[PDB]
Design a protein around this nucleic acid. Structure first.
Length: 96
DNA sequence: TCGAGCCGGAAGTTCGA
DNA sequence: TCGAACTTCCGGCTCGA
């Protein structure tokens, strides 16, 4: 149920790239049971990132991390050209 | 009536080549 | 060693049941 370290064989040393990590988990088969991955073009909707958020804060060594941290940090992620936010709903995420 | 989610600017330490 | 990178910090706004 963890196509993460099972597919790319994640090493315990040398943290991967942030958007690469999300993108790596993005193509997760179980994401359907923990989130919504439509099988059409390329649209990703966050229904209940309960484990995704905890894991996001787990790498940061924190007990519980608020998802607002993603909106506050991820939004500021407009550094170059990678994950853009969709002006649809407040939970719609998309990549280009 | 009441609380929850949403995000602007700022600062500071550390990463890969 | 160089420049850049992501996180955490402070507090204000508005809608739905």
């Amino acid at each position: 149920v963890i196509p993460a370290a099972a597919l790319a064989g994640y090493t315990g040393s040398g943290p991967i790239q942030l958007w690469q990590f999300l993108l790596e988990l993005l193509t997760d088969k179980s994401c359907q049971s923990f989130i919504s991955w439509t099988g059409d073009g390329w649209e990703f909707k966050l229904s209940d990132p309960d484990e995704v958020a905890r894991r996001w804060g787990k790498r940061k060594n924190k007990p519980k991390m608020n998802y607002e941290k993603l909106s506050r940090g991820l939004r500021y992620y407009y550094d170059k050209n990678i994950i853009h936010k969709t002006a649809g709903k407040r939970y719609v995420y998309r990549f280009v």
